[PDB]
Write a protein that binds this ligand. Structure first.
Ligand SMILES: CCCCCC[C@@H]1C(=O)Nc2ccc(Br)cc2[C@H]1C(=O)O
Ligand SMILES: [Br-]
Length: 133
C-alpha cells in the first residue's frame, strides 16, 4: 500500500527548466529539442513489492521495474547507462542515478491532485507537473 497514491496513468501538464536540467546532465542538442517537446504519459503500477513506472511519448517509451532500496540498471531516455536506486523518504519517491562519477536525483511526490516530478543535477532543478489522465 506503500505507493497507492502514485498508482495510475498521469499526463504531463507543465514543465519548467527542463532544457537546462538536460544540459546539466549532458544531453545533446537534438535530443533535448525532441525530448523537450514530448508530452509523456507516466504509468505507475505496483504488484507485490515490485513497482513499475513507464514513460510513454512520441519521443521514447521507457519502463523500469524495481524494489525500493534495491539498486538496478537503467538505460535512460537519453541513453545513459546508469545505476539507479529508488527509495521512499517521507512519502516521496527518491530516485538516484549514478554514472561516470556523476549523480542526479529525481523526486516524485503527490501534491493535491498532481504528481510533481523534480529533477535535480547540481544546482539545476526542473519541475514537471503531471495530472491524472
Ligand atoms: C532525455 C530526458 C532525461 C531526463 C528524464 C527525466 C524524467 C524521467 O524520469 N523520465 C522522462 C522520460 C521522458 C521524458 Br521527455 C521526460 C522524463 C522526465 C519526466 O518524468 O517528465
Ligand atoms: Br518523453
Amino acid at each position: 500500500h506503500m505507493c497507492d497514491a502514485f498508482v495510475g496513468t498521469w499526463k504531463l501538464v507543465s514543465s519548467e527548466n527542463f532544457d537546462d536540467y538536460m544540459k546539466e546532465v549532458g544531453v545533446g542538442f537534438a535530443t533535448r529539442k525532441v525530448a523537450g517537446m514530448a508530452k509523456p504519459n507516466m504509468i505507475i503500477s505496483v504488484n507485490g513489492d515490485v513497482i513499475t513506472i513507464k514513460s510513454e511519448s512520441t519521443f521514447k517509451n521507457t519502463e523500469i521495474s524495481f524494489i525500493l532500496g534495491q539498486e538496478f540498471d537503467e538505460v535512460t531516455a537519453d541513453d545513459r547507462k546508469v545505476k539507479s536506486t529508488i527509495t521512499l523518504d517521507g512519502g516521496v519517491l527518491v530516485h538516484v542515478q549514478k554514472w561516470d562519477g556523476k549523480s542526479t536525483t529525481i523526486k516524485r511526490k503527490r501534491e493535491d491532485d498532481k504528481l510533481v516530478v523534480e529533477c535535480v543535477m547540481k544546482g539545476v532543478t526542473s519541475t514537471r507537473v503531471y495530472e491524472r489522465a
